[PDB]
Amino acid sequence: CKGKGAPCRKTMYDCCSGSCGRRGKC
């Protein structure tokens, strides 16, 4: 899975830890 503040795909459960949160980065 991803990691932090990388470009992330909000709806598709993109992030390894937290989530593609308000800022639209992982």
Q: How far apart are CA 5 and CA 25, in angstroms?
A: 5
Rounded alpha-carbon distances, angstroms, from residue 22 to 1, 17: 19, 15
Structure-block tokens of residue 24 = 């639209």
Dihedral sign from CA coordinates of 5, 9, 17, 19: positive
Structure-block tokens of residue 2 = 């991803």
Of 15, 1, 12, give the one whose Cα is nearest residue 25. Answer: 15
Residues 6+ away with beta carbon under 8 Å from 8: 2, 14, 15, 20, 24, 25, 26
Rg (CA), the chain: 7
Q: How far apart are CA 21 and CA 9, in angstroms?
A: 10
DSSP for 1-26, please give it.
Answer: ---TTSB--GGG---SSS-S-TTSB-
